[PDB]
Amino acid sequence: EFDYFILALQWAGTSCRSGGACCPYNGCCKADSPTQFTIHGLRPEYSGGERPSCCTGGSFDPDEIMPFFGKLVEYWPTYRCALEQSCNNRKEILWGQQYEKHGTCASPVIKGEWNYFKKTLKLFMKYNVDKALEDAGIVASNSKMYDLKDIVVAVESAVGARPKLRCDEEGLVQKLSLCFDKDFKPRDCVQVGSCPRYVSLPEIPD
């Protein structure tokens, strides 16, 4: 039983600050493009001791991604060069792991692969945090820090609900999550203490 969905987004600059080698599907390699928040995954919010994962034991079928491939590569890249540990000790690409581990547990609100990726992408584009931040003048930078409050206000004003921010211990923004109800309408996320008063949104390392 759950009431809300959580859409987890990752800040590319922080996921890429530990260099690495360019490999397929990697979001840290791609000529020249601005650093932005990309999709990590959509999942049911469980808060009662038990937190289910892998609910159908259903094999991820890459064929059902087709009408979304271009968008997934651009907005849902991976930041590791290895396959992700998924259900049944099965190695999988990020999209697969997210679908099997969480999307299956979203039934019947979300039924099947297609609808999972379709819904996740729709929410990302409709309530676009990157556009909100850019509008406020909050952009990737290695020399300037930002008031945490400026970022929160930008997202709330644009999306209509309070997000959840998570920073590493050096004050770098790592993730930003949005919460939604079963009808996919924005809802304030539970308050959390992670980020200091001033934070940084580093650019992807060259």
mmCIF file of C-alpha atoms in Angstrom:
data_model
loop_
_atom_site.group_PDB
_atom_site.id
_atom_site.type_symbol
_atom_site.label_atom_id
_atom_site.label_comp_id
_atom_site.label_asym_id
_atom_site.label_seq_id
_atom_site.Cartn_x
_atom_site.Cartn_y
_atom_site.Cartn_z
ATOM 1 C CA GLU A 1 0.000 0.000 0.000
ATOM 2 C CA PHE A 2 1.233 3.474 -0.961
ATOM 3 C CA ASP A 3 -0.237 6.929 -1.545
ATOM 4 C CA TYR A 4 2.454 8.647 -3.558
ATOM 5 C CA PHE A 5 5.015 8.286 -6.325
ATOM 6 C CA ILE A 6 8.519 9.706 -6.190
ATOM 7 C CA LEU A 7 10.313 10.915 -9.321
ATOM 8 C CA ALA A 8 14.037 10.925 -8.580
ATOM 9 C CA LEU A 9 16.283 13.217 -10.619
ATOM 10 C CA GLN A 10 20.075 13.370 -10.561
ATOM 11 C CA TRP A 11 22.325 16.363 -11.136
ATOM 12 C CA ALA A 12 24.660 15.438 -13.994
ATOM 13 C CA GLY A 13 27.497 17.642 -12.749
ATOM 14 C CA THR A 14 27.747 15.759 -9.471
ATOM 15 C CA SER A 15 27.313 12.269 -10.935
ATOM 16 C CA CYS A 16 30.170 13.061 -13.322
ATOM 17 C CA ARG A 17 32.630 14.797 -11.000
ATOM 18 C CA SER A 18 34.551 11.587 -10.369
ATOM 19 C CA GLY A 19 35.838 11.498 -13.943
ATOM 20 C CA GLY A 20 35.618 8.020 -15.420
ATOM 21 C CA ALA A 21 35.865 6.444 -18.861
ATOM 22 C CA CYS A 22 33.286 7.086 -21.581
ATOM 23 C CA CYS A 23 31.105 4.071 -22.235
ATOM 24 C CA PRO A 24 27.765 3.427 -23.959
ATOM 25 C CA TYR A 25 24.692 5.208 -22.531
ATOM 26 C CA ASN A 26 26.875 7.328 -20.244
ATOM 27 C CA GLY A 27 25.502 10.780 -19.489
ATOM 28 C CA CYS A 28 28.929 12.328 -18.851
ATOM 29 C CA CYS A 29 29.943 12.032 -22.525
ATOM 30 C CA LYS A 30 28.155 13.797 -25.397
ATOM 31 C CA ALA A 31 30.064 16.564 -27.201
ATOM 32 C CA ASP A 32 28.736 19.856 -25.809
ATOM 33 C CA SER A 33 25.457 20.286 -23.942
ATOM 34 C CA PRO A 34 24.476 22.093 -20.724
ATOM 35 C CA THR A 35 24.584 20.293 -17.388
ATOM 36 C CA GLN A 36 21.103 19.400 -16.176
ATOM 37 C CA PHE A 37 18.947 17.247 -13.936
ATOM 38 C CA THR A 38 18.223 13.901 -15.624
ATOM 39 C CA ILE A 39 15.869 11.056 -14.707
ATOM 40 C CA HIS A 40 17.023 8.321 -12.364
ATOM 41 C CA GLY A 41 13.616 6.672 -11.933
ATOM 42 C CA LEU A 42 9.983 6.669 -10.799
ATOM 43 C CA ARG A 43 8.887 4.570 -7.818
ATOM 44 C CA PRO A 44 6.059 4.016 -5.296
ATOM 45 C CA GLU A 45 6.743 5.681 -1.942
ATOM 46 C CA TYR A 46 6.668 3.003 0.773
ATOM 47 C CA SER A 47 7.023 4.081 4.409
ATOM 48 C CA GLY A 48 6.005 1.148 6.593
ATOM 49 C CA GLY A 49 8.923 -1.066 7.561
ATOM 50 C CA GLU A 50 8.513 -3.092 4.387
ATOM 51 C CA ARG A 51 9.539 -1.620 1.054
ATOM 52 C CA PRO A 52 8.824 -4.007 -1.876
ATOM 53 C CA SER A 53 10.967 -4.317 -5.003
ATOM 54 C CA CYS A 54 10.665 -6.698 -7.957
ATOM 55 C CA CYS A 55 6.920 -7.337 -7.828
ATOM 56 C CA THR A 56 6.277 -9.434 -10.933
ATOM 57 C CA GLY A 57 9.439 -11.338 -11.760
ATOM 58 C CA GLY A 58 8.658 -10.220 -15.297
ATOM 59 C CA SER A 59 11.566 -10.077 -17.745
ATOM 60 C CA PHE A 60 12.331 -6.596 -19.077
ATOM 61 C CA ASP A 61 11.722 -6.480 -22.827
ATOM 62 C CA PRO A 62 13.802 -3.779 -24.609
ATOM 63 C CA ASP A 63 11.465 -3.939 -27.632
ATOM 64 C CA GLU A 64 8.743 -2.064 -25.742
ATOM 65 C CA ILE A 65 10.959 1.039 -25.425
ATOM 66 C CA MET A 66 11.053 1.880 -29.156
ATOM 67 C CA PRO A 67 8.949 5.041 -29.327
ATOM 68 C CA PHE A 68 11.069 6.492 -26.501
ATOM 69 C CA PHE A 69 14.667 5.530 -27.293
ATOM 70 C CA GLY A 70 15.894 8.973 -28.337
ATOM 71 C CA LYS A 71 14.317 10.613 -25.315
ATOM 72 C CA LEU A 72 15.661 7.989 -22.897
ATOM 73 C CA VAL A 73 19.235 8.359 -24.148
ATOM 74 C CA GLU A 74 19.050 12.117 -23.735
ATOM 75 C CA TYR A 75 16.987 12.429 -20.541
ATOM 76 C CA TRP A 76 17.534 9.098 -18.792
ATOM 77 C CA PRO A 77 21.254 8.301 -19.272
ATOM 78 C CA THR A 78 23.284 6.183 -16.876
ATOM 79 C CA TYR A 79 26.270 7.474 -14.911
ATOM 80 C CA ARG A 80 28.053 4.133 -14.480
ATOM 81 C CA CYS A 81 29.875 2.014 -17.039
ATOM 82 C CA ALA A 82 28.721 -1.274 -15.565
ATOM 83 C CA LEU A 83 25.317 -2.952 -15.795
ATOM 84 C CA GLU A 84 23.006 -2.446 -12.821
ATOM 85 C CA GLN A 85 22.266 -5.178 -10.292
ATOM 86 C CA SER A 86 18.599 -6.004 -10.891
ATOM 87 C CA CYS A 87 16.012 -8.621 -9.885
ATOM 88 C CA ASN A 88 17.150 -12.262 -9.620
ATOM 89 C CA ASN A 89 20.856 -11.421 -9.753
ATOM 90 C CA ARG A 90 20.141 -10.325 -13.330
ATOM 91 C CA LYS A 91 22.391 -7.610 -14.737
ATOM 92 C CA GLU A 92 20.416 -4.874 -16.485
ATOM 93 C CA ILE A 93 20.690 -1.410 -17.981
ATOM 94 C CA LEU A 94 19.319 1.391 -15.793
ATOM 95 C CA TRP A 95 15.954 1.551 -17.583
ATOM 96 C CA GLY A 96 15.505 -2.178 -17.098
ATOM 97 C CA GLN A 97 16.518 -2.210 -13.451
ATOM 98 C CA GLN A 98 14.195 0.701 -12.626
ATOM 99 C CA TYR A 99 11.293 -0.958 -14.387
ATOM 100 C CA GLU A 100 11.735 -4.401 -12.809
ATOM 101 C CA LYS A 101 12.645 -3.201 -9.320
ATOM 102 C CA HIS A 102 10.019 -0.441 -9.057
ATOM 103 C CA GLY A 103 7.713 -0.170 -12.053
ATOM 104 C CA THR A 104 6.353 -3.662 -11.456
ATOM 105 C CA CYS A 105 5.359 -2.617 -7.932
ATOM 106 C CA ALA A 106 3.360 0.308 -9.355
ATOM 107 C CA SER A 107 0.647 -1.893 -10.844
ATOM 108 C CA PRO A 108 -2.256 -1.377 -11.376
ATOM 109 C CA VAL A 109 -1.781 2.408 -11.426
ATOM 110 C CA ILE A 110 0.945 1.803 -14.006
ATOM 111 C CA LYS A 111 0.538 -1.316 -16.139
ATOM 112 C CA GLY A 112 3.504 -2.523 -18.146
ATOM 113 C CA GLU A 113 6.784 -1.203 -19.510
ATOM 114 C CA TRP A 114 5.374 1.127 -22.130
ATOM 115 C CA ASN A 115 3.145 3.036 -19.725
ATOM 116 C CA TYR A 116 5.955 3.182 -17.165
ATOM 117 C CA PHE A 117 8.402 4.955 -19.482
ATOM 118 C CA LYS A 118 5.649 7.000 -21.094
ATOM 119 C CA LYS A 119 4.395 8.276 -17.732
ATOM 120 C CA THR A 120 7.852 8.902 -16.331
ATOM 121 C CA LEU A 121 8.859 10.949 -19.389
ATOM 122 C CA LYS A 122 5.578 12.888 -19.439
ATOM 123 C CA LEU A 123 6.028 13.937 -15.819
ATOM 124 C CA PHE A 124 9.629 14.989 -16.408
ATOM 125 C CA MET A 125 8.668 17.184 -19.372
ATOM 126 C CA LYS A 126 5.436 18.585 -17.940
ATOM 127 C CA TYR A 127 6.949 19.576 -14.574
ATOM 128 C CA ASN A 128 10.398 20.418 -15.887
ATOM 129 C CA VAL A 129 12.723 21.487 -13.102
ATOM 130 C CA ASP A 130 15.545 22.369 -15.511
ATOM 131 C CA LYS A 131 13.348 24.990 -17.196
ATOM 132 C CA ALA A 132 12.258 26.387 -13.819
ATOM 133 C CA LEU A 133 15.838 26.846 -12.612
ATOM 134 C CA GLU A 134 17.009 28.348 -15.891
ATOM 135 C CA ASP A 135 14.114 30.841 -15.757
ATOM 136 C CA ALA A 136 15.222 31.948 -12.303
ATOM 137 C CA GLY A 137 18.827 32.290 -13.424
ATOM 138 C CA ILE A 138 20.048 29.231 -11.535
ATOM 139 C CA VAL A 139 22.522 27.502 -13.843
ATOM 140 C CA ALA A 140 25.423 25.054 -13.633
ATOM 141 C CA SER A 141 28.564 26.748 -12.344
ATOM 142 C CA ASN A 142 31.880 25.739 -10.806
ATOM 143 C CA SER A 143 32.593 29.162 -9.312
ATOM 144 C CA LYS A 144 29.323 30.204 -7.693
ATOM 145 C CA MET A 145 27.251 28.702 -4.916
ATOM 146 C CA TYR A 146 23.497 29.183 -4.529
ATOM 147 C CA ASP A 147 21.197 29.853 -1.612
ATOM 148 C CA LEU A 148 19.328 26.595 -1.017
ATOM 149 C CA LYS A 149 16.127 28.623 -0.634
ATOM 150 C CA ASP A 150 16.417 30.116 -4.133
ATOM 151 C CA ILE A 151 16.352 26.639 -5.655
ATOM 152 C CA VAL A 152 13.457 25.378 -3.534
ATOM 153 C CA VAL A 153 11.365 28.460 -4.286
ATOM 154 C CA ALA A 154 12.026 28.118 -7.999
ATOM 155 C CA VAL A 155 10.800 24.506 -8.096
ATOM 156 C CA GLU A 156 7.790 25.070 -5.846
ATOM 157 C CA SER A 157 6.735 28.157 -7.805
ATOM 158 C CA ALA A 158 7.008 26.306 -11.099
ATOM 159 C CA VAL A 159 5.738 22.831 -10.143
ATOM 160 C CA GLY A 160 3.332 23.835 -7.388
ATOM 161 C CA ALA A 161 4.778 21.475 -4.754
ATOM 162 C CA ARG A 162 7.783 21.195 -2.461
ATOM 163 C CA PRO A 163 10.643 18.972 -3.735
ATOM 164 C CA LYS A 164 13.150 16.959 -1.709
ATOM 165 C CA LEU A 165 16.826 17.925 -2.163
ATOM 166 C CA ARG A 166 19.792 15.736 -1.282
ATOM 167 C CA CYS A 167 23.427 16.935 -1.217
ATOM 168 C CA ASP A 168 26.716 15.143 -0.654
ATOM 169 C CA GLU A 169 28.863 16.160 2.338
ATOM 170 C CA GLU A 170 30.800 18.837 0.441
ATOM 171 C CA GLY A 171 27.576 20.694 -0.302
ATOM 172 C CA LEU A 172 27.033 19.491 -3.882
ATOM 173 C CA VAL A 173 23.474 18.866 -5.030
ATOM 174 C CA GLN A 174 23.112 15.201 -5.939
ATOM 175 C CA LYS A 175 19.424 14.530 -6.333
ATOM 176 C CA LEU A 176 16.105 16.323 -6.482
ATOM 177 C CA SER A 177 12.872 14.398 -6.066
ATOM 178 C CA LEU A 178 9.281 15.353 -6.827
ATOM 179 C CA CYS A 179 6.298 13.670 -5.204
ATOM 180 C CA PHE A 180 2.957 12.884 -6.899
ATOM 181 C CA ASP A 181 -0.352 11.282 -5.887
ATOM 182 C CA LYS A 182 -2.022 8.326 -7.646
ATOM 183 C CA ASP A 183 -3.552 10.810 -10.097
ATOM 184 C CA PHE A 184 -0.069 12.099 -10.884
ATOM 185 C CA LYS A 185 -0.736 15.547 -9.476
ATOM 186 C CA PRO A 186 2.163 17.193 -7.591
ATOM 187 C CA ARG A 187 2.277 16.883 -3.806
ATOM 188 C CA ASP A 188 4.746 18.285 -1.288
ATOM 189 C CA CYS A 189 7.459 15.763 -0.466
ATOM 190 C CA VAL A 190 8.309 15.051 3.179
ATOM 191 C CA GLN A 191 10.823 17.559 4.577
ATOM 192 C CA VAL A 192 14.418 16.332 4.887
ATOM 193 C CA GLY A 193 17.694 17.675 6.248
ATOM 194 C CA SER A 194 20.586 17.145 3.856
ATOM 195 C CA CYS A 195 21.780 20.263 2.103
ATOM 196 C CA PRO A 196 23.566 23.165 3.833
ATOM 197 C CA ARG A 197 22.419 26.788 3.351
ATOM 198 C CA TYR A 198 24.644 27.283 0.313
ATOM 199 C CA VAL A 199 24.977 24.665 -2.401
ATOM 200 C CA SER A 200 26.753 24.140 -5.674
ATOM 201 C CA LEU A 201 25.546 22.933 -9.061
ATOM 202 C CA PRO A 202 28.825 21.960 -10.758
ATOM 203 C CA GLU A 203 29.098 21.517 -14.512
ATOM 204 C CA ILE A 204 30.002 18.174 -16.046
ATOM 205 C CA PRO A 205 33.817 17.897 -15.988
ATOM 206 C CA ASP A 206 35.467 18.268 -19.406
#
